[PDB]
Amino acid sequence: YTGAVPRANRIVQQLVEAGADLANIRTMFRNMLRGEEMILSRAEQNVFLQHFPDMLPCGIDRNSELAIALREALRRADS
């Protein structure tokens, strides 16, 4: 399956593979959607670039299906 939800789950999977702290990523991403750059490891950055290719010059659109799905997935994993 390749909808926004399985894709967001893949992001979370890759983040944990990369040693990320999901609580931290959740906070970082919430701030990204507000417009603040994330402080990421090279590994964490590379995960995000696989899924949000224009992130560095353009930020991430909080209304995009994938950003919504990732917001949801990070919240659910962080409960």
Ligand SMILES: [Cl-]
């Ligand atoms: Cl998608």
Ligand SMILES: [Cl-]
């Ligand atoms: Cl690299």
Ligand SMILES: [Cl-]
């Ligand atoms: Cl792609």
Ligand SMILES: [Cl-]
């Ligand atoms: Cl909460």
Ligand code: NA
């Ligand atoms: Na995207």
